[PDB]
Design a protein around this ligand. Structure first.
Ligand SMILES: CC[C@@H](C#N)NC(=O)c1ccccc1
Lengths: 300, 237
């Protein structure tokens, strides 16, 4: 079990760690988060009490180094940093734990939610989507735009998701125009899975990261990316059985977790109604369809 | 964007454009079978692709053999239209390729856009106009060449005959759309109007009769009357 200490909490802020969050008051004696499960990626994330716009945060994997948060009063945000002096870090953490100024990552033993939401997400792939190679952790916020969004403006601060575009030459083989546009199997299996992603696990990993960015930061390009990757599978007639079954599980836990009042900006009516009721895979998402109909029948 | 009453003179500027209409691509007669079930028999069709400025019509004849062994024919008709329009553009010299293609039904937008991915600088547009191009098969010479075809065939026409020698394109297209609106609302009356006088003939190289300017005014009035009329007969006014 690992620890992310905080130097201090100078400004009132709502702090999130994965799907948990808690309020810290201006200059409250708060020195971080303990008992963080090893073996998963995580996202620490922030919503200033003053300015609820620009929620931001950091994706990290405690196996990759000792990380801490420190408020920066010049740039005015909580910044993640790496401590390279391992002895200095253990000492700092132990002192803060002894003084019990740390909240405990509050995982219920039965609860596989985070694992299910991050099963295929790997830090090494996150770092290729979020390019900042001098750090082992990755910053995302509400306003960062995607590579595809910038094609339709600062490249260093972008989300480099795999571009998917159903009306593109990459997606449509010459002479298979109708066939490839109505049955995206080619684009899914040859172009994307075999060509770009290499395997379905990298595909699912980007898909899950897109959703999490979409839910945690209301990042709009991420939501677009999540729906696109769903729609590409649902619109393919030929999808390995194992991918369909895993997709059903993936989506199920995203829908289960997606807070109810954020659904109308994070759920695309057209894509879901198509995927669940019109598409080739309309019969292959039993769990996702059942939770969607019981929890969001309005959208459908 | 979409083409409507407000940006109507754009049709007659000097940017090459084509209207494409797919209404008459997939045509069927419905009949009863010996067993008392219903079945369709396809008849030849046509893509109506028209340069509104010049009057040049690229009438691609769709022979019923296209449909043999195919499923979901109405959806395939849209893709077949798109494939044939895109082959037409590719056949044309660069300086003759359109800069816009306006489709008369929005269902053609995705089919055409996918087939034209190779022409990113050709704008594919819908329209809000209720253009009467479906009535093209009420023009006897067009109907005749479609029904006689025994194979796929492109036939080239000028749908304005020689009118542009005397009137502008704007007036030419307004006349055409009035004739076709009339033919669509009451084909018999419309054709009666056009041929009543046996002394006005259709040149062999023309589609419509050789009316004088004065005679076209009378004809145009008669077609307007028809169109208002049938509108009453239909709504009782
Ligand atoms: C679309 C709403 C979105 C944004 N921005 N999400 C949150 O605020 C939020 C905060 C904490 C945990 C889960 C969700």
């Amino acid at each position: 079990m690992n620890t992310v200490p905080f130097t201090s909490a100078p400004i009132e802020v709502t702090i999130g760690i994965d799907q948990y969050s808690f309020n810290v008051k201006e200059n409250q004696p708060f020195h971080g988060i303990k008992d963080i499960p090893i073996g998963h990626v995580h996202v620490i994330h922030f919503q200033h009490a003053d300015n609820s716009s620009m929620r931001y945060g950091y994706w990290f994997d405690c196996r990759m180094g000792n990380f801490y948060i420190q408020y920066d009063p010049k740039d005015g945000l909580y910044k993640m940093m790496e401590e390279r002096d391992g002895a200095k870090f253990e000492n700092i953490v132990h002192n803060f734990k002894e003084r019990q100024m740390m909240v405990s990552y509050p995982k219920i033993d039965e609860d596989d939610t985070w694992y299910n939401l991050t099963e295929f997400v790997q830090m090494d792939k996150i770092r290729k989507i979020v390019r900042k190679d001098e750090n082992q952790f990755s910053y995302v916020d509400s306003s960062m735009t995607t590579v595809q969004e910038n094609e339709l403006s600062d490249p260093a601060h972008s989300l480099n998701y795999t571009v998917i575009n159903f009306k593109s030459r990459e997606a449509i083989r010459p002479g298979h125009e109708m066939e490839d546009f109505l049955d995206k199997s080619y684009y899914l299996n040859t172009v994307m899975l075999q060509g770009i992603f290499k395997n379905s696990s990298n595909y699912f990993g980007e898909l899950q990261f897109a959703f999490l960015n979409a839910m945690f930061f209301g990042n709009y390009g991420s939501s677009l990316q999540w729906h696109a990757m769903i729609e590409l599978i649902c619109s393919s007639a030929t999808v390995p059985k194992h991918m369909l079954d895993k997709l059903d599980e993936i989506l199920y836990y995203q829908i289960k977790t997606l807070p109810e009042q954020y659904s109308d900006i994070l759920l695309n009516e057209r894509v879901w109604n198509i995927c669940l009721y019109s598409s080739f895979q309309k019969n292959s998402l039993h769990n996702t369809e059942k939770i969607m109909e019981n929890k969001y029948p309005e959208l459908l | 964007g979409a083409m409507n009453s407000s940006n109507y003179a754009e049709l007659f500027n000097n940017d090459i454009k084509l209207f494409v209409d797919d209404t008459n691509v997939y045509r069927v007669t419905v009949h009863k079978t010996f067993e008392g079930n219903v079945a369709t028999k396809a008849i030849n069709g046509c893509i109506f692709t028209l340069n509104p400025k010049t009057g040049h019509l690229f009438l691609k004849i769709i022979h019923t053999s296209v449909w043999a062994g195919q499923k979901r024919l109405s959806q395939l008709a849209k893709w077949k239209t798109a494939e044939e329009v895109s082959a037409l553009v590719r056949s044309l010299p660069k300086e003759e390729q359109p800069k816009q293609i306006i489709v008369t039904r929005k269902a053609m937008l995705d089919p055409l856009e996918v087939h034209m991915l190779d022409f990113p600088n050709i704008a594919i547009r819908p329209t809000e106009l209720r253009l009467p191009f479906s009535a093209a098969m009420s023009i006897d010479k067009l109907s005749d060449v479609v029904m006689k075809a025994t194979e796929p065939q492109m036939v080239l026409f000028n749908i304005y005959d020689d009118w542009l020698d005397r009137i502008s394109s704007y007036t030419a297209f307004s006349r055409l759309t009035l004739l076709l609106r009339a033919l669509k609302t009451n084909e018999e009356s419309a054709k009666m109007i056009l041929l009543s006088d046996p002394t006005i003939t259709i040149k062999s190289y023309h589609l419509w009769p050789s009316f004088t300017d004065e005679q076209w005014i009378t004809i145009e009035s008669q077609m307007r009357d028809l169109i208002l009329t049938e509108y009453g007969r239909k709504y009782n006014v």
